[PDB]
Amino acid sequence: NLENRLEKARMKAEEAEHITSVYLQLKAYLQEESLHLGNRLDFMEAEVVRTK
Amino acid sequence: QRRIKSLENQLDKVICRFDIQLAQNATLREELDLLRIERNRYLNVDRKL
Amino acid sequence: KPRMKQLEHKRAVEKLIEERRNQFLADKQRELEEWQWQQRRQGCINAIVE
Amino acid sequence: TFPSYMAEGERLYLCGEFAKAAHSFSNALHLQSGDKNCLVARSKCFLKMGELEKSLEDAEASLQGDPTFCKGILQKAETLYTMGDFEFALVFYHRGYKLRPDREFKVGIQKAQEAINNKIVRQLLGELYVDKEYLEKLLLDEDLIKGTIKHGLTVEDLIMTGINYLETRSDFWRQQKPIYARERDRKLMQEK
Amino acid sequence: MREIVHLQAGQCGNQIGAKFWEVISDEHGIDPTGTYHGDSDLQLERINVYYNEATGGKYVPRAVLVDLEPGTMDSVRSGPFGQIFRPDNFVFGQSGAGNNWAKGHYTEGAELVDSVLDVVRKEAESCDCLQGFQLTHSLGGGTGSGMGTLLISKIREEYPDRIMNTFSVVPSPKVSDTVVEPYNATLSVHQLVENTDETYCIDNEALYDICFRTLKLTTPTYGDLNHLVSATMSGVTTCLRFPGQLNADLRKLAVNMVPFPRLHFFMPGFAPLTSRGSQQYRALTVPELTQQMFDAKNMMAACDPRHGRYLTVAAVFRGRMSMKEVDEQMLNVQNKNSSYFVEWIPNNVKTAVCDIPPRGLKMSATFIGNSTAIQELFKRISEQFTAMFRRKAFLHWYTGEGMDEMEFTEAESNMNDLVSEYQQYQD
Amino acid sequence: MREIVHLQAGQCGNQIGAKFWEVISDEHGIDPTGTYHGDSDLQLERINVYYNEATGGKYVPRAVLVDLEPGTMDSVRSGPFGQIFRPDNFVFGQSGAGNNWAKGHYTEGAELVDSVLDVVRKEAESCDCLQGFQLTHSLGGGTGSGMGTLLISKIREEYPDRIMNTFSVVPSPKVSDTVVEPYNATLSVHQLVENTDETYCIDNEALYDICFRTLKLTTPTYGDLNHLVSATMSGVTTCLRFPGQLNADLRKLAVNMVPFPRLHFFMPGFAPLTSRGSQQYRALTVPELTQQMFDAKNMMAACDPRHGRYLTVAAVFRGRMSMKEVDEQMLNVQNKNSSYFVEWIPNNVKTAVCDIPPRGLKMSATFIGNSTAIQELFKRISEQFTAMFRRKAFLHWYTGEGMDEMEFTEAESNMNDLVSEYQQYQD
Amino acid sequence: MRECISVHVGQAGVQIGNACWELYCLEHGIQPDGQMPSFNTFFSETGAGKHVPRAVFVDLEPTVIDEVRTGTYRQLFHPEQLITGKEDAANNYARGHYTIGKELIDLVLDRIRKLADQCTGLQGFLIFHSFGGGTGSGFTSLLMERLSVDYGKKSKLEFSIYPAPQVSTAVVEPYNSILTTHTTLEHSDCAFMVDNEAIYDICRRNLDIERPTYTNLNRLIGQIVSSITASLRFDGALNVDLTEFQTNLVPYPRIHFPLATYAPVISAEKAYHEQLSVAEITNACFEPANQMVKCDPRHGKYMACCLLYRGDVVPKDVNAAIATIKTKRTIQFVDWCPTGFKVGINYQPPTVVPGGDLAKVQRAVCMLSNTTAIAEAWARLDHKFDLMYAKRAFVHWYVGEGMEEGEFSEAREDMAALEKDYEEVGMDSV
Numbered sequence A: 001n002l003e004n005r006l007e008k009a010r011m012k013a014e015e016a017e018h019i020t021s022v023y024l025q026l027k028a029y030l031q032e033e034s035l036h037l038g039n040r041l042d043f044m045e046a047e048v049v050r051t052k
Numbered sequence B: 001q002r003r004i005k006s007l008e009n010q011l012d013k014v015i016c017r018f019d020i021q022l023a024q025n026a027t028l029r030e031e032l033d034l035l036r037i038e039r040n041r042y043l044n045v046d047r048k049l
Numbered sequence C: 001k002p003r004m005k006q007l008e009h010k011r012a013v014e015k016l017i018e019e020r021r022n023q024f025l026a027d028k029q030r031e032l033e034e035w036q037w038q039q040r041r042q043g044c045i046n047a048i049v050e
Numbered sequence D: 001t002f003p004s005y006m007a008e009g010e011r012l013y014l015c016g017e018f019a020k021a022a023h024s025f026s027n028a029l030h031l032q033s034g035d036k037n038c039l040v041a042r043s044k045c046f047l048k049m050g051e052l053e054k055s056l057e058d059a060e061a062s063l064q065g066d067p068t069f070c071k072g073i074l075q076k077a078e079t080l081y082t083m084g085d086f087e088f089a090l091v092f093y094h095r096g097y098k099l100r101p102d103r104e105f106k107v108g109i110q111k112a113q114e115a116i117n118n119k120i121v122r123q124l125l126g127e128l129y130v131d132k133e134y135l136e137k138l139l140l141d142e143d144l145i146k147g148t149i150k151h152g153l154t155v156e157d158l159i160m161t162g163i164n165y166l167e168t169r170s171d172f173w174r175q176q177k178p179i180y181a182r183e184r185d186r187k188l189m190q191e192k
Numbered sequence E, F: 001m002r003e004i005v006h007l008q009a010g011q012c013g014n015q016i017g018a019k020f021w022e023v024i025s026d027e028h029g030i031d032p033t034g035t036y037h038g039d040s041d042l043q044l045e046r047i048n049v050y051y052n053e054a055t056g057g058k059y060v061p062r063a064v065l066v067d068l069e070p071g072t073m074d075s076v077r078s079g080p081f082g083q084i085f086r087p088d089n090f091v092f093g094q095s096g097a098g099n100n101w102a103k104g105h106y107t108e109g110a111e112l113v114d115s116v117l118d119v120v121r122k123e124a125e126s127c128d129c130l131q132g133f134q135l136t137h138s139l140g141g142g143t144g145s146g147m148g149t150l151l152i153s154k155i156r157e158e159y160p161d162r163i164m165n166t167f168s169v170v171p172s173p174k175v176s177d178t179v180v181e182p183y184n185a186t187l188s189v190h191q192l193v194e195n196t197d198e199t200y201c202i203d204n205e206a207l208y209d210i211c212f213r214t215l216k217l218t219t220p221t222y223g224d225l226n227h228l229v230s231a232t233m234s235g236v237t238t239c240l241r242f243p244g245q246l247n248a249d250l251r252k253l254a255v256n257m258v259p260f261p262r263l264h265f266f267m268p269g270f271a272p273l274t275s276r277g278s279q280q281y282r283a284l285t286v287p288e289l290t291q292q293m294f295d296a297k298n299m300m301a302a303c304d305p306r307h308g309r310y311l312t313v314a315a316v317f318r319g320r321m322s323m324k325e326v327d328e329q330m331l332n333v334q335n336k337n338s339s340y341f342v343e344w345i346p347n348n349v350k351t352a353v354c355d356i357p358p359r360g361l362k363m364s365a366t367f368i369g370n371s372t373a374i375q376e377l378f379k380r381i382s383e384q385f386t387a388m389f390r391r392k393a394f395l396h397w398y399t400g401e402g403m404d405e406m407e408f409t410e411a412e413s414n415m416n417d418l419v420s421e422y423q424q425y426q427d
Numbered sequence G: 001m002r003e004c005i006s007v008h009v010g011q012a013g014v015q016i017g018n019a020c021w022e023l024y025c026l027e028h029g030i031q032p033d034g035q036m037p038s039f040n041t042f043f044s045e046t047g048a049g050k051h052v053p054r055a056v057f058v059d060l061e062p063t064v065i066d067e068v069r070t071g072t073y074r075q076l077f078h079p080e081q082l083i084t085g086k087e088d089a090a091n092n093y094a095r096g097h098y099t100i101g102k103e104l105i106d107l108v109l110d111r112i113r114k115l116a117d118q119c120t121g122l123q124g125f126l127i128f129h130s131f132g133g134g135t136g137s138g139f140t141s142l143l144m145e146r147l148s149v150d151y152g153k154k155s156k157l158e159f160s161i162y163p164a165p166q167v168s169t170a171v172v173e174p175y176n177s178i179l180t181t182h183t184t185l186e187h188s189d190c191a192f193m194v195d196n197e198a199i200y201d202i203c204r205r206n207l208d209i210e211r212p213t214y215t216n217l218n219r220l221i222g223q224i225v226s227s228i229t230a231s232l233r234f235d236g237a238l239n240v241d242l243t244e245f246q247t248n249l250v251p252y253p254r255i256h257f258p259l260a261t262y263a264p265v266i267s268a269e270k271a272y273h274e275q276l277s278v279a280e281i282t283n284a285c286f287e288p289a290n291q292m293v294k295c296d297p298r299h300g301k302y303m304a305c306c307l308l309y310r311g312d313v314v315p316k317d318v319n320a321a322i323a324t325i326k327t328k329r330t331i332q333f334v335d336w337c338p339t340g341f342k343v344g345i346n347y348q349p350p351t352v353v354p355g356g357d358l359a360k361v362q363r364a365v366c367m368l369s370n371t372t373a374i375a376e377a378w379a380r381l382d383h384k385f386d387l388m389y390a391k392r393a394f395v396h397w398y399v400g401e402g403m404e405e406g407e408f409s410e411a412r413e414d415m416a417a418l419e420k421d422y423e424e425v426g427m428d429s430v
């Protein structure tokens, strides 16, 4: 009985290991892009000026 | 006897690591939303412009 | 007057250099003297054992 | 040649990343074809990667040479009973125990036992606290952020890769503990 | 100010209290007779909690020490801090309660109950706002199981409000001291579930483990086991006798450690219990006194808490400490073991902090934790009960003393129910 | 701050290990009781690398001591710096491992391995940034290899991102001290090739001569021999506990060394090793130390580097000196002696300079070297193994405790393929 | 109101700065404590008297950056901008740029942004690191990636410790050098190159003292930085700022790698015996012996050169000091850049550090030029990479640190075009 609840939790741990890895990679795409997020708006702010 | 004993200590560690894993997954998925809210904020002023 | 009040703040804020550093040195001796006091208490209980 | 690719690939496998390890395992196959030692090493690295079918291919293509490699005898854990339905994998767990005892084989034997006798609500029951992740990794797919490119692959691929394994683990947990058996356990407990 | 009227009942209790009264006597200063000789007013200040003022500045304790065999009380006098006890608050019968719940709860005992209730009444209404009415005793004997649970009963009728703590000794799992242990214990756990409001299960088998697997001792005397228990007590009543940053008395450690009327059986546990050779090699950072408390070992009750889901845990911390280190470390516990803490209650942990530490240390704690693992304790006792009533063994000595069989069955039922309910909330 | 747990397991381990702690406290100024009593401040600024603080000066060493039969461990206790270690760390069983890998890696081993990893896990959580581990096995033997391998493997599965250096005595070439040493080595080297990062072959026949030819000691005992092996461990890890011009953490000294992920076996070496009254006739300049540094007569391993090809060599110089001189002498080496160095990695030497000299020595310079010539050692053990496995010698005393022949066959295959890997680069 | 931010990164970059910030403390009369007994460009003012240097010292290994915050200069630096690390780089590009680099960026750039807000007229940046070390290669190139998008048009000057041709310290050093040059090509402005062994050579011959070390090595590097930036603060006859160095050191955006040279590097005794005139100190720059990088100038062609003078230099005798250079044939000038030269004049003679080996001269000139002889210096480093990568030598650590192998092939491919530009520069056009 105790091995059966060890391997079941060993199974349950790894499917929580994966979800950490797919969320950190999802973070990394949002983080780098938040840097280019401002100057794109600044460029388009000047776009409203140039066609004014 | 020691088998059962060592196996208790083992199961504990496994269920405890799973727990701290859910924790970091929960420290995230809140800060993931903290990277989605300004993500759901510029494109409303991008689509404005 | 603006020069000597920034200088006045200069002496006033460097007194918090010496007060807080001395407080830190007084705090570490206070917890150290607690360690000897618990150990000299253990010296007294080891007496009545002896 | 071959000894570099194993040693990094086994170390990468232990170090948490499995995608890059399997690549290092796969490059070693372009040194010698029938290499049972490494064929099981892929299937260890491929079961952990969420997907299932390639791991079985490497599992079988290992043990199509000789049934003597005890490390590869461990690998067939991923057969039917543990992957679905309600009976098979014990037929090999016992024949592995006919070989060297290998206390890890017994773990599979005690697991493959009397369990052979056996949307929101179903997901929350079958999946544990990671069911909060499952819906949330599906509610993040109803946006425009999906159509992106991280490195070679797409952001929508990753948002569905985590959902793919969680859906795969959903049936894996359902096969082990049936919903029908769950009602019987609760009813017998309350009555007694 | 509030006070507590100890009801040292039973042989085991007589002893459990004696080492305890010495422990509180010291913390406060009351020397082996009474004259306060402390080194900080912080002590005397609120002594009323466990000590009544007399003349010549004497602080005789407030303990209606009781028994049914005039011998244990006699030893309690002829001991260390024993002159303190009053020569009138010792209620002693003549006929022993030969290990027979009946002899103590229905026959021999009763005779003494009137005298006990009298003294209790007296020392009780001689206060301003009594806060409690503890009763240290064992559940596997005669006087305790018998007269003890009758006192608890008539007292919860006379004063129907004051907290009724009951540091109790539940029969050990493996080795036992008596043979008729089951019957006695089972019967006592029925006149305790629907009466007391804070029972603390302490087990000897468990205690021994914490005096050989943690205290690296080799010759543990029943006395040394009693000192570990006395420490738990001091702690549960510390934030009321000495000031602090987040004080919590008994009523609070209740509205924050019992999630259902019946469910009231809590397991204890101390914090800094290290050996001599190691006393110096270990540091006392709050993290350390937190690890040595949530472990299954440092639990004075032999019921692995790894097989249940703590409905709620507490922590009467004691010692000048950092409220951050405490709350922070307690969140790490709250999360690291979220799979061992029930979810229907979001946050399960009460964190009190005192200032005056246990005499000679730097920090301490008590792990009063309501777990669904106590279900196992009663089930082992019940497994034994149903395995004796089945053949009406050792029952001719009970039915005799005005006792019916339905009473016995009613205990199995009211015990089976506790165990059953405990599991319903463990799911 | 980076931390290094010193796992010592076995007679030769707990022996040199003790010496290691003597030749480390002296530097960090610690007494045989646990208290800073040194001169310069730079000494307790980085005590957080091998010594965790306790209460008030007691720097309790972060060493886990393991064996199988109370003996070598008791020697470390009843000795000089012997009580500094925390009691718990001393984890021992009761039976011996009669140099039988099977015992230490199968039958018994496991019994204590669980406890061993417990203390390790604990002292791993008490770290800011775990750099890695530092095992100390005697290889050829039981409590040494048998156990170490088990522990080494367990650690690499728990911490797959730590540099586990393994100062190990290699089955001596000429006079061995165990009729079954070949057997042990075969299985051992196999595990420490897929589970380690920087091994250091500390052979004995070599050390027993370096003290006879260079130090001219008339009666070299094990005591003196261990001062040499201890020194190297302190050198490898000197830029992690003291300031410098070009620091080099273990990871650095590994990346710049371990070439392909398997040839990670290195040859040890110290620098100022002159006799007692011979110093007067010998200066101490980077030029001079370098003659000795690269002299193959001062290598703590047996294989002669002038019978192979230095793949990558490093040197953790410790002392106030001139980086120019360091580079100049090292440059000359690569040029003057080129054939003896491999050519596919032009820069073949790594220099490092910690600016805190050793005790009573202005300039010390530990040299670590990945020399292909190690083929000899591997081949020798393989050869000796070949002779025994053949006529199935002492095998019922190995396979008797669970170890199929195929295990030892697999082992041989690996050890031999390591020789192939090295020679493939020599040509 | 015209300041510039200097970021010093790595074991190398910090120890350069400690021997460089002692020069700014001695030129301005700044005390080590931080108070006076103009400053503006390299020193801030917290309205009280305690001068704070506008420098951020970032490193991944705490044991060296701890010496700055415990030594003599502990009160001068802000304790929170002087940021330490937790895990070390281990000479890995894949660690300081992909694994442990990314965890020390959400606050390091926050320091640079706050130091940018304190200024009003910033125009330049200044970086010290080494191409060989893991922090100076990986963490630097991430900073180039971050600063290219955060600031952009602002100038980003650079000083590096080049791979020594003959000697070396690390053996994955060519691995670090190629990958850091890959990122520096497009995300940097001008990368001033200095190596180690040539300074060891000029400390033998010109400087009388022998057995040099990192103290004398970094004080000379402190001198080349102090000489190149002194024109911001002191009034001179012909002044020059950092954004001016953009347009006259690079003709093409791919080449941005010039060299340094300190001319009056002389000992205390030897300066008694010769007079230092600006005619003689100018043609002492062009000798290959005095060149601070081991590149023989006769192999290459000079593309553009900068001569920043200090002290009582007379501009009457600087054009005569240059007209002698162009008439002699050992310096090669051809048609596609017949101009080739500039000078900058300052009125502050160079200061002397106590205990230093330099002599307190008044006519100090620093020669700053980009040559086509860097091609042969890079003709070995790409060969160095092609001799190790030809059979996959040490790169298993890199692919163990978040690195995919695929960039190494295009690290070759992007670097292979670089000397293809060099052969296009050297050919004459008819």
Ligand SMILES: Nc1nc2c(ncn2[C@@H]2O[C@H](COP(=O)(O)OP(=O)(O)OP(=O)(O)O)[C@@H](O)[C@H]2O)c(=O)[nH]1
Pocket: F245, F246, F247, G009, G010, G011, G012, G013, G015, G016, G060, G061, G088, G089, G090, G091, G129, G130, G131, G132, G133, G134, G135, G136, G137, G161, G168, G169, G170, G196, G214, G217, G218, G221
């Ligand atoms: N000129 C000069 N060069 C230095 C100094 N310190 C280190 N270096 C150079 O740095 C190169 C190797 O880099 P490292 O020693 O690893 O230092 P790093 O570049 O900061 O890399 P990390 O140590 O990982 O942080 C050597 O070849 C040296 O030339 C210094 O103080 N002055």
Ligand SMILES: Nc1nc2c(ncn2[C@@H]2O[C@H](COP(=O)(O)OP(=O)(O)O)[C@@H](O)[C@H]2O)c(=O)[nH]1
Pocket: E010, E011, E012, E013, E015, E016, E097, E099, E138, E139, E140, E141, E142, E143, E144, E145, E146, E169, E176, E177, E178, E204, E222, E223, E225, E226
């Ligand atoms: N912890 C502890 N338990 C005791 C002590 N003395 C007796 N006991 C327990 O109490 C039981 C003895 O019964 P006893 O107290 O004489 O019965 P009672 O007085 O009639 O209720 C045994 O099962 C012991 O476990 C003691 O000093 N310490």
Ligand SMILES: Nc1nc2c(ncn2[C@@H]2O[C@H](COP(=O)(O)OP(=O)(O)O)[C@@H](O)[C@H]2O)c(=O)[nH]1
Pocket: F009, F010, F011, F012, F013, F015, F016, F099, F138, F140, F141, F142, F143, F144, F145, F169, F172, F176, F177, F178, F204, F222, F223, F225, F226, F229
């Ligand atoms: N350096 C060193 N080597 C030792 C010492 N004692 C024994 N050895 C070596 O250890 C080898 C035998 O190891 P062994 O005693 O079997 O280790 P065990 O199996 O762990 O008990 C011999 O070849 C010795 O050369 C010592 O104090 N120092």
Ligand SMILES: [Mg+2]
Pocket: F247, G010, G011, G061, G088, G089, G135
């Ligand atoms: Mg560094």
